Amino acid sequence: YDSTPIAKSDRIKRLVDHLYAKMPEIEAARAELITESFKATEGQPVVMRKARAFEHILKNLPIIIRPEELIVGSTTIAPRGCQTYPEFSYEWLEAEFETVETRSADPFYISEETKKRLLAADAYWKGKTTSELATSYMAPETLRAMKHNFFTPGNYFYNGVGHVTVQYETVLAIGLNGVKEKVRKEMENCHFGDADYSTKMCFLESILISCDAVITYANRYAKMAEEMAEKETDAARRQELLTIARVCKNVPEFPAESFQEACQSFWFIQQVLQIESSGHSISPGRFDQYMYPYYEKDLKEGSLTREYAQELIDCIWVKLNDLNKCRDAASAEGFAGYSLFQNLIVGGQTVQGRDATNDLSFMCITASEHVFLPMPSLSIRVWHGSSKALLMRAAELTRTGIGLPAYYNDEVIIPALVHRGATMDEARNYNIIGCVEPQVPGKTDGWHDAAFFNMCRPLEMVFSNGYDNGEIASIQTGNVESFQSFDEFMEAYRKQMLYNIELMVNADNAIDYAHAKLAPLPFESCLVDDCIKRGMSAQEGGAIYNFTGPQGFGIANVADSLYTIKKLVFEEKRITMGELKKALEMNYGKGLDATTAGDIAMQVAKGLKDAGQEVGPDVIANTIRQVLEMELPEDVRKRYEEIHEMILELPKYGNDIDEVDELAREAAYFYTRPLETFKNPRGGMYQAGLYPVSANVPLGAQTGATPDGRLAHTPVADGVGPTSGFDISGPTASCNSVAKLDHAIASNGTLFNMKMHPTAMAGEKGLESFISLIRGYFDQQGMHMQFNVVDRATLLDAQAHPEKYSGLIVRVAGYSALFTTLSKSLQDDIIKRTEQ
Amino acid sequence: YDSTPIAKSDRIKRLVDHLYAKMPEIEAARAELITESFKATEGQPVVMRKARAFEHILKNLPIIIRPEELIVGSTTIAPRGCQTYPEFSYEWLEAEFETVETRSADPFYISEETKKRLLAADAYWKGKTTSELATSYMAPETLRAMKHNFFTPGNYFYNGVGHVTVQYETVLAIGLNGVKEKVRKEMENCHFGDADYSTKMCFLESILISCDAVITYANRYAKMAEEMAEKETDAARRQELLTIARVCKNVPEFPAESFQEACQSFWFIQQVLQIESSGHSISPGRFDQYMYPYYEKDLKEGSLTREYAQELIDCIWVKLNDLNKCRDAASAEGFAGYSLFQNLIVGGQTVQGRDATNDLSFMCITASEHVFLPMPSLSIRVWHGSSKALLMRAAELTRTGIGLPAYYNDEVIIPALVHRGATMDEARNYNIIGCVEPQVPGKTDGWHDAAFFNMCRPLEMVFSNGYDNGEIASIQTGNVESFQSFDEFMEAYRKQMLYNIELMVNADNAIDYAHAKLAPLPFESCLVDDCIKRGMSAQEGGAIYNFTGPQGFGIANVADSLYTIKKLVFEEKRITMGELKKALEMNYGKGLDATTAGDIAMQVAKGLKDAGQEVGPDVIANTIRQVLEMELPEDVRKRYEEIHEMILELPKYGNDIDEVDELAREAAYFYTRPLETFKNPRGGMYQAGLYPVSANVPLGAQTGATPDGRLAHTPVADGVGPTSGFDISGPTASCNSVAKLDHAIASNGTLFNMKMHPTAMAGEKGLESFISLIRGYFDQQGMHMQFNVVDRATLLDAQAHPEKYSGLIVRVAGYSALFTTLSKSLQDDIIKRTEQ
């Protein structure tokens, strides 16, 4: 390989500026077309109706070729816009018609005419959505757990599943023509009298229709390019348009004959998957591996230059940021920054077990530097034989502050995959899904972000004996002041965890049934083994590997909390259990907020109503103002303060202190061990992940004060790393603590955020000690690390004067985003993260 | 037991006359109520929607207590009326609004207001019916086979499945209260995190709702009875009404405490099953066995007389004729006479293997004599240890000409059931479903009348090389004149059979998926093992035993046809294959009819249209009149006549001639052996039956002339018996022939019709030789026999003067019917049956 960086074309910046010239906009065409199709296919099998709707959408959806695009394919007329997906849900969106343009997280413009069109189209989907069927399949206890914010399964409730790396390489090598032939060959194994003939053959026919729809789609672009070429006065651009027309007539119907054909074929698959369904984390995976044969052949024949190849890849990077998705306001806070979590990884090992680095490995890193946008979520696989040149080039990218690539440990991930059932050859070919979730590509339906679980809420339930704001919200594990030992408290916590984990399994399994019954996806399925052979969609159990992956939040908070309780209450006896409980209720005497005011206001109102009495707005308004203005007796306030102070002085997780860290390990197991025993309706197993996306901020807002010293309704920790400001012994000590967790059992992936001051990366020696930091953690079986590289003054100035920082990127968690597109509360969370 | 006949109450004749005072009428209330409920439950799981609709129907359906009824429960206000079932299909009914009142088979009155109400209610079901989903799941080749009348799967296409004997004894012993408790106990085995929790628990909750709906229904009758009692001036009737109110408050919620409670509980179950679904052949089964403990206890305590017990049973017999079902005109011709095929059997063996005869066994026979209506389809189990007194009493009933009971052979049926997978204890407890289909009661979803298959149509395809009226209609097995041996012809027939049998499997399996997906039945399911434990409906695979049972038509015609071909064409060479083929086309020179005129007219029209030319009504009208008036050259006509004559002189099936009969056996295997290898989507096997209902007349109308000498479009044989007028050697010889078939492999049941002159039954000696006739057949492993006992003059006079014969019953096939409610073509078929 030749690691010298390839020059950047002047086209790229113009492509980028065009994406961002206007607000993202919501468009109504998809909703109209899916409604139109479904009205015409009533009475037919579900999967055939989905195929026909996909066909109808791709035939009629407005298409556009944006100025100077080499790779074409746009899902909305407005750049960075989105279509809507009423088959999953829509009531949330109609409820936000007047507010979504100016909401605090991921705002979208929507026109008056679009509102009217959505209203008419959506009406059809009332009583037909996955979300409504899912709801009916959830236990009452499950609904209660969600109402009290133990967990949220919103992701696949409101929108599609996704979270998959499909067989891009199959499409490149044999075309959709080849996939159809595979389907037709399987059809020959089916006989009229087979017990599964009706359903198998319907699914197989649905694939044929879906493949021809995508071919049709590509040819619409060829036609548009030809018409544009005819009226193009610029001679060079006209030729570009004519090349586009030739390319789109060949791919993805046929095997790719050139690097540009491979790029265009890839992009059409990447795009239409996200038209078929709104599931995000559609992850390109090992793009440097499967694109390489097409690059190499073009190059060696002299028909392709490195410069044009780089330009094409840069164009794909831009396109990856053109796609978008609108989520309801509450959901959006957990997925903030307009990400689609399209994870693309470089390097690692071949199936043979040799280093996989090639020319494209470096060019993918360069493309991230060239385009400098949030997507794709660039990743690198690190192993003992990694090319040093590739690692240093990755470190160079990280030094820019863009937060890329994220670093993943082959030596832990490969055995974890094998343990969950992959072969060694399969595991060696893994890539990452979305944020940090590993998978065998082209063979898996992994449900890699099925829910967010707040591990602090079961802890709060131990204190409150399963009550929340006066009502029963969980099991009763006992009056917390009756516990005679730390082991008894721990056991109560274990049970609160187990009870609520099982309810989360109920919620996800309910949503699973809803997708299986109402939203099988023939196009996504045909590119995943073994759907064709089994005659069923990936949503029904057709995939070889099936998982459900829900995420645990707050390990640092829980560990430190338990340490506080063990040390100050039971051993040293410096605080009574009752004092601690009451200090937490009163936010350590630091003041009660709007959330607490509202809670108590609602509790007071319910008591009045339950006793058949009037709910006087005067009584409740004076309850609110009272909570907000409450002042404690000075002696009591004083005591809560010194309680807080002695808690903040305790040793904390993230400083290589064994006695704290062992509790982090033990508490993590209360989440990860039960989960690996549960099963899903697709015939696979649950597996815990430990990562936050941006949801640690809203989950923390649902969480009272905790014994680690964290104040009420502030964010919980991001991932498996230490609490901000608590890790005060430098990065090596922090890594040592975090590596004491069992990461491998959390085989849906763990996330370790770290923030470096830019001086840490300075020079070749800076880059080398950076790499050594990562290897030191990986050598202790850590799974993943990723880095912000930025000084505090920069982030504060970007808050005060966003207009100077329109291009500033920060690492959130498992993805990067434009800093000034993030809300103040998320920005603040990122800013207070420990600077090493 | 005490076999003396119990007196008939004067109430019975008045109950009967009331049923028949007016035409059966179609009512709209059910369709309105199911539509109302489904509109309110959109978005919920299917099975929950079915439970809620069943609940809504039973809460609101108009109820009535008819004059003098002791056992109450009516599904329509009009006696012998029907509700409608748009969840399965409705377009056929709307298309018959103007004609159904005066149609030739099973007419129904429908008011102008009912038409309007059905139109409004039905509109909702467009694109939501089982029939539409079934259609989409059928292969194109399957649709072609049906278009050319190889088979019809109409039964479960247009309406519900049924064909089951549910656990009546469970309801009697523990009540629906007990069933609910069983459900709640199974719920305790389900945990929130189980992979099947959502679907299992939804099904179990659906059962609870369905059980409470039926309890509600019964209590509506208690309330109505109380209100009627208050305004009843007749003191004795008032007391009857007050007893009804007490009974309906106890059953079927609670275990039956009296014989009348047992009767009423039974009837409510019999009735509501047929409100939940329009599936017929809901068969009471071994009523003399499970009702007996309730009878005996009442009797021995002195609280019940034999006379009142008989009156109650007579009342149930009347009620069984109050229920009805409207089928589309074409379908109705195959199920003619308003039957619901409610099969009720007496006698047989206990699980211990002793004779099961008891007092109720005789009283059931008496009730058939008392009420003298078509239903129930009374049956008797015959075994080597049968009570001679019960057999003679059965023979006495048969002698009346009512066609009852039908006779079934334990010694063949019990091993056949065991061979298909039942235990010996289960098989010993068998009863009959519908016409002749044996089943282990309370454990089976048997699909016992899944389709009608015309075994003559594949024979016609051998002659025509798979063409029908100029188009390809089946596989091409070769030019029939190229066959060099009889074995080659036989092999061609075997292949025509196999091809079309597999398409029939495709059709039924397609309809199976449609019921599984859109019409699970929680109430029927909860009374069948093992639905509760498995957490799924009987329509999805919850039953322990699962079958599909399609019927083969025309064994006698096929056997004799093959004998003609073997003898006159290949061995003796008295006819050329070409002569035979052409003689058949020309109906042996006996004239071409309206059906042939239409066929050729359509063929001529298609040829013109296919060649892009005009379809002149003059050209087609002259084609019609031409066919109808065609006269053959005299020499050709003469030859066809002598060909017919030498065919009619051949020995025929049904005369104990081995060389003919061996072909009947061999040809039957071409149907029964392939079928036992196919599987259905409920995880069970196909099993052939050989019975016709009344469909041998319309199937014959779809069949050209055959080499047995049968003229074009006349009926094919009924069941496995010989062709009418061909069995000329007396009944023993006929039995000997029919017993050469393999009956046991046709484990869905075979049917043997025989007609006796009344003199054959005269006196004790007549009855005794009757019994010996049956035993002679059963000793040769025959499965079933049933008898008309009537002279020809009676049937002809009933045709000429129906007003003298309003009560005349004849045996059709597997059921009895009022002769003057049958169409002329069916009456004629019954009349020309061989009189022994």
Whole-angstrom Cα distance, residue A107 to residue A327?
10
Sequence-ordered list of residues with C-beta below 8 angstroms from that of A553, at least 6 positions apart, any chain: A452, A453, A454, A455, A456, A692, A695, A696, A699, A716, A717
- The pairs formed by A90-94 with CB atoms below 8 angstroms and a separation of 24 or more are A90/A31, A90/A118, A90/A122, A90/A125, A90/A129, A92/A158, A92/A328, A93/A26, A93/A118, A93/A122, A93/A326, A93/A328, A94/A118, A94/A119, A94/A122
B202 closest CB neighbour out of A137, A192, A678 = A137
- CA dihedral sign of residues B626, B631, B636, B640: positive
Residue with tokens 């100025």: A67
Cα→Cα distances B429→A410, B346, B403, B438, Å: 64, 11, 24, 10
Cα→Cα distances B295→B259, B285, B357, B363, Å: 5, 17, 14, 11
Maximum separation of any 2 CA atoms in chain A, in Å = 86
Provide the token pair at A90.
């829509």
Residue with tokens 């690059």: A295
Alpha helices in B452-521 (DSSP H): 456-464, 486-518
Whole-angstrom Cα distance, residue A529 to residue A440?
11
Which of A300, A296, A314, A234 lies closest to A259, judged by CA?
A296
- CA dihedral sign of residues B537, B539, B540, B542: positive
Which of B522, B517, B516 lies closest to B50, judged by CA?
B522
Q: What technique was this entry resolved by?
A: X-ray
CA B584 from chain center: how many Å? 32
Whole-angstrom Cα distance, residue B9 to residue B312?
10
CA A831 from chain center: how many Å? 21
Alpha helices in A4-122 (DSSP H): 11-19, 29-41, 46-60, 91-94, 112-122
Contacts of B201 in chain A (CB under 8 A): 139
Provide the token pair at A18.
């065009």
In chain A, what are the domains?
1-836 (3.20.70.20)
Residue with tokens 């690492």: A811
SS3 A104: coil
- The helix (run of H) or strand (run of E) holding residue B553 is strand B550-553
Q: Determine what percent of chain B falls in helix, strand and coil, rounding each to the nearest 5.
A: 50, 10, 40
Q: State the CB neighbour count (10 A cutoff) for residue B677.
A: 12
Which of A141, A163, A159 lies closest to A150, judged by CA?
A141
Contacts of A193 in chain B (CB under 8 A): 502, 505-506, 509, 678
Q: What is the DSSP letter of B779?
A: T
Strand duo B471-472 + B809-811: pairing: unpaired
Sequence-ordered list of residues with C-beta below 8 angstroms from that of B679, at least 6 positions apart, any chain: A194, A195, B685, B686
Cis-peptide into B376, omega within 30 deg: yes
SS3 A71: coil
- The helix (run of H) or strand (run of E) holding residue A186 is helix A168-187
Residue with tokens 């434009």: A818
Q: Are A403 and A787 in contact (CB under 8 A)?
A: yes
Query: Within 13 A of A104's CA, how many CA atoms are on the CB side?
Result: 10
Provide the token pair at B216.
């509600």
Q: Are A199 and B513 within 8 A, CB to CB?
A: yes
CA A257 from chain center: how many Å? 34
Residue type at A432 in one-letter notation: I
Q: Are B513 and A139 within 8 A, CB to CB?
A: no
Provide the token pair at A161.
């599943």
SS3 A449: coil
- Closest chain B residue to A498, measured at CA: B193
Q: Which of B437, B460, B524, B540 is catalytic?
A: B437
Question: Of A49, A128, A129, A197, which to mutate for an interface test with B (greatest number of B Cβ within 10 Å)?
Answer: A197
- Closest chain A residue to B199, measured at CA: A137
The minimum CA-CA distance between A752 and chain B, rounded to whole Å, is 29
Query: Within 13 A of B305's CA, how many CA atoms are on the CB side?
Result: 6
Whole-angstrom Cα distance, residue B169 to residue B182?
15
Tell me the residue length of chain A.
836
Q: How many separate helices (H) and strands (E) can be counted in chain B? A: 35, 17
Dihedral of the alpha carbons of A260, A266, A272, A273, in degrees to the nearest 10: -170
Q: Are B505 and A128 within 8 A, CB to CB?
A: no
- The helix (run of H) or strand (run of E) holding residue A546 is strand A545-548
Whole-angstrom Cα distance, residue A376 to residue A402?
12
Which residues share a beta bridge with A349?
A355
Maximum separation of any 2 CA atoms in chain B, in Å = 86
Residue with tokens 């021995």: B300
| Distance spanning both ends of chain B, measured CA to CA | 34
CA B652 from chain center: how many Å? 29
Q: Are A690 and A436 in contact (CB under 8 A)?
A: no
Dihedral of the alpha carbons of B460, B461, B463, B468, in degrees to the nearest 10: 90
Among chain B, residues having any CB pair with chain A shorter than 8 Å are 42-45, 48, 126-129, 132-133, 136-139, 141-142, 191-199, 201-202, 502-503, 505-506, 509-510, 513, 678-681, 683
Verify whether residue A364 is a known catalytic residue: no
Residue type at B629 in one-letter notation: E
Residue with tokens 């750049």: A79
- The helix (run of H) or strand (run of E) holding residue A810 is strand A809-811
Q: What is the DSSP letter of A286?
A: S
SS3 B499: helix
Which of A187, A192, A214, A211 lies closest to A535, judged by CA?
A187
- CA dihedral sign of residues A470, A476, A478, A481: negative
Whole-angstrom Cα distance, residue B185 to residue B807?
51
Provide the token pair at B491.
């092999």
Q: What is the DSSP letter of A752?
A: B
Provide the token pair at A796.
């504060």
CA B687 from chain center: how many Å? 16
Q: Are A640 and A583 in contact (CB under 8 A)?
A: yes
Whole-angstrom Cα distance, residue A39 to residue B224?
45
SS3 B377: strand
Whole-angstrom Cα distance, residue B9 to residue A22?
90
Cα→Cα distances A135→A84, A593, A633, B486, Å: 20, 32, 47, 66
Sequence-ordered list of residues with C-beta below 8 angstroms from that of B26, at least 6 positions apart, any chain: B81, B82, B84, B93, B100, B108, B109, B110, B114, B118, B326
Tell me the residue length of chain B.
836
Q: Are A5 and A366 in contact (CB under 8 A)?
A: yes
Which of B741, B739, B699, B735 lies closest to B717, judged by CA?
B699
**Quick one: residue A535, left, alpha or beta (phi over 0 = left, psi -120 to 50 = alpha)?**
left
Q: State the CB neighbour count (10 A cutoff) for residue A145.
A: 27
- The helix (run of H) or strand (run of E) holding residue B406 is strand B406-409
- The helix (run of H) or strand (run of E) holding residue A299 is helix A292-300
SS3 A742: coil
Helical pair A259-276 and A235-250, crossing angle rounded to 10 deg = 70
Q: Are B759 and B774 in contact (CB under 8 A)?
A: no
Whole-angstrom Cα distance, residue A76 to residue B599?
56
Q: Are B192 and A506 within 8 A, CB to CB?
A: yes
Which of A591, A530, A503, A527 lies closest to A200, judged by CA?
A530
Contacts of A503 in chain B (CB under 8 A): 192
Q: Are B780 and B752 in contact (CB under 8 A)?
A: no
Q: State the CB neighbour count (10 A cutoff) for residue B634.
A: 9
Which of A638, A494, A652, A497 lies closest to A567, judged by CA?
A652
List the beta strands (DSSP E) in B253-354: 343-347
Q: State the CB neighbour count (10 A cutoff) for residue A517.
A: 19
Cα→Cα distances A740→A245, A653, A718, Å: 56, 10, 17
Q: Are B514 and B137 in contact (CB under 8 A)?
A: yes
Task: Concatenate the DSSP letters of all residues of A30-60 into one string.
Answer: HHHHHHHHHHHHTTS-HHHHHHHHHHHHHHH
- Closest chain B residue to A135, measured at CA: B44
Query: Within 13 A of B397's CA, how many CA atoms are on the CB side?
Result: 31
Which residues share a beta bridge with B472?
B467
Provide the token pair at B588.
């042996």
Residue type at A588 in one-letter notation: Y
SS3 B788: strand
Exposure b/e, A555-575, CB count within 10 A at least 16 = b: bbbbbbbbbbbbbbbbeeeeb
Whole-angstrom Cα Rg for chain A? 27
Whole-angstrom Cα distance, residue A831 to residue A808?
14
B42 closest CB neighbour out of A127, A679, A683 = A127
Residue type at B698 in one-letter notation: P
Sequence-ordered list of residues with C-beta below 8 angstroms from that of B512, at least 6 positions apart, any chain: B447, B548, B680, B681, B682
Whole-angstrom Cα distance, residue A145 to residue A511?
16
- The helix (run of H) or strand (run of E) holding residue A246 is helix A235-250
Whole-angstrom Cα distance, residue B310 to residue B364?
8
- The pairs formed by A488-497 with CB atoms below 8 angstroms and a separation of 24 or more are A489/A462, A489/A562, A489/A565, A489/A570, A490/A562, A490/A666, A492/A462, A493/A458, A493/A459, A493/A462, A493/A562, A493/A667, A493/A670, A494/A670, A496/A458, A496/A459, A496/A461, A496/A462, A496/A466, A497/A455, A497/A458, A497/A670, A497/A671, A497/A674
Verify whether residue B190 is a known catalytic residue: no
Whole-angstrom Cα distance, residue A676 to residue A659?
26
Among chain A, residues having any CB pair with chain B shorter than 8 Å are 42-45, 48, 126-129, 132-133, 136-139, 141-142, 191-199, 201-202, 502-503, 505-506, 509-510, 513, 678-681, 683
SS3 B345: strand
SS3 B818: strand
Which of B323, B261, B288, B287 lies closest to B168, judged by CA?
B287
Strand duo A816-818 + A809-811: pairing: antiparallel
Task: Concatenate the DSSP letters of all residues of A794-806 into one string.
Answer: HHHHHHH-GGG-T
Exposure b/e, B719-736, CB count within 10 A at least 16 = b: bbbbbbebbebebebbbb
Cis-peptide into A530, omega within 30 deg: yes
Cα→Cα distances A159→A47, A85, A93, Å: 18, 7, 12
Cα→Cα distances A458→A381, A495, B218, Å: 35, 9, 48
SS3 A553: strand
Q: What is the DSSP letter of A759?
A: G
| Distance spanning both ends of chain A, measured CA to CA | 34
